[PDB]
């Protein structure tokens, strides 16, 4: 209840935790990214931040006395990496000693318009940079603040802030019951995906090209990414069910946005689009289902839209335009992630997401996961 | 991979002492923030001592402040923890933990 509405952002410039570092206290903006396992600061300054942690003002400050160099999938980053300690003030009030990176070389990391100065990792050990031997952030909190290993997100920014539960689940953000698919492997937060659904209608694919090479859950990318094979399916799919007569090919690919006048919405003019997962009991299957308020984004009178949906190299990423529609549970002490209807997420008194099941896997292997 | 086994629990009685250690091996222990956590029989897991890699910076837990002094010695890669003044809140099995890995445990049972 402490931790309730301590996010601020949206999917876009993404969402962030207030944290005091160090010895007086320095106050920073930090990144909420289930995608990553390292904890970093900017450390010197930048075009586009307006505040850095400074090493010199901390008097408990410590340096490791190595480099460290973290890739993203869009940026990367150089840093020190030292320990001080951390206090949580919307939720915790006590200090920890934790491992940090004090950024002072970066390559598309700090974006102009982004409100965070710092990144919070919240991944498995297996991820942390430079070895699984770096105490991660979420690991130095469980140890020292005597929580149950799991935490809990809700994301209230779809259109036009949030909560980071850090300990345990919040019975007022969440509607209905929790569905719960398993955790299949401990690097990313991997799922297994079963079957995509556009309009109703299910794509012509084998259960497996879901889980090339793997499907995660991370807050800290912005849109659905879907192996190409995938995108063009649910491109194709799409169109076909939509009232738009024709699209131009640079709408699908981010190249050109789609324009209305007047005070005109999308969202009447798309399907629905639903993704089945599997239930801990293997045999059954729940969908998550988003409608176009999730996945056509606001960027003469014009208001323009995104297509918010990517095609990628390897990977099935549930985005934070996916998470903006439920309260998401990250069960690490029983290995699995957990699905619930969000209040908090509607866009003009209505809904913009529903989670519906038990459905039958009868129809799909026993494990789609290659 | 990373390896870790506590020594030094026992059986005292209300105002005892005893010295805990931890051995560490498979990781660079010189370059790692080490914890004392404690387990006691009927209640939850129970955070003791943090200590920095060099040893300079140290936390306590508030029902253990004054009375444990948590220390380490990097060249021979050993973590310690001086229980003083004991009391029979202190019965658990102590472990030696880092980046989510604990040793088997010492226990330590205060009559």
């Known amino acids: 209840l402490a931790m309730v509405d301590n996010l601020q952002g949206d999917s876009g410039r993404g969402y962030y935790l207030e944290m005091l570092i160090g010895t007086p206290p320095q106050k920073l903006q930090i990144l909420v990214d289930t995608g990553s396992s390292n904890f970093a600061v900017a450390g010197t300054p930048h075009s586009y931040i307006d505040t850095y942690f400074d090493t010199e003002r901390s008097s408990t400050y410590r340096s490791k006395g190595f480099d460290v160099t973290v890739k993203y999938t869009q940026g990367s980053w150089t840093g020190f990496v030292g320990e001080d300690l951390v206090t949580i003030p919307k939720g915790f009030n006590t200090s920890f000693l934790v491992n940090i990176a004090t950024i002072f070389e970066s390559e598309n990391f700090f974006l102009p318009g982004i409100k965070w100065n710092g990144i919070l990792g919240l991944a498995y050990a297996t991820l942390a940079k430079p070895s699984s031997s770096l105490e991660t952030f979420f690991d130095s909190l469980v140890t020292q603040a005597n929580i149950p290993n799991v935490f809990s997100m809700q994301m209230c920014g779809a259109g036009l802030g949030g909560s980071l539960v850090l300990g345990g689940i919040e019975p007022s953000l969440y509607k209905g019951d929790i569905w719960y698919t398993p955790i299949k492997e401990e690097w990313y937060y991997q799922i297994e995906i079963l079957k995509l659904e556009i309009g109703g209608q299910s794509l012509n694919l084998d259960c497996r090209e879901y889980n090339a090479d793997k499907a995660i859950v991370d807050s800290g990318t912005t849109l659905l990414r879907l192996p190409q094979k995938v995108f063009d399916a649910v491109v194709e799919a799409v169109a076909r069910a939509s009232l738009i007569p024709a699209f131009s090919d640079g709408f699908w690919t981010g190249s050109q946005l789609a324009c209305w006048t007047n005070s005109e919405t999308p969202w009447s003019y798309f399907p629905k689009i639903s993704i089945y997962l599997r239930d801990e009991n293997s045999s059954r299957s729940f969908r998550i289902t988003i409608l176009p308020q999730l996945y056509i984004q606001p960027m003469l009178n014009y208001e323009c839209y995104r297509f918010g949906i990517s095609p990628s190299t390897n990977a099935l990423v549930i985005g934070a335009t996916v998470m903006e529609g439920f309260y998401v549970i990250f069960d690490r002490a029983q290995k699995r992630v957990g699905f619930a209807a969000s209040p908090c997420a509607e866009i003009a008194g209505a809904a913009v997401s529903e989670i519906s099941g038990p459905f039958s896997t009868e129809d799909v292997a026993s494990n789609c996961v290659p | 991979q990373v390896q870790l086994q506590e020594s030094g629990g026992g059986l005292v009685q209300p105002g005892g002492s005893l010295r805990l250690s931890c051995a560490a091996s498979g990781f660079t222990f010189s370059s790692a923030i080490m914890t004392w956590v404690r387990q006691a029989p009927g209640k939850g897991r129970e955070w003791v001592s943090t200590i920095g890699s060099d040893g300079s910076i140290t936390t306590y837990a508030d029902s253990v402040k004054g009375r444990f002094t948590i220390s380490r010695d990097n060249a021979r890669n050993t973590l310690y923890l001086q229980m003083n003044s004991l009391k029979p809140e202190d019965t658990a099995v102590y472990y030696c933990?880092?980046?989510?890995?604990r040793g088997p445990g010492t226990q330590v049972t205060v009559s």
């Open positions: 933990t880092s980046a989510g890995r």
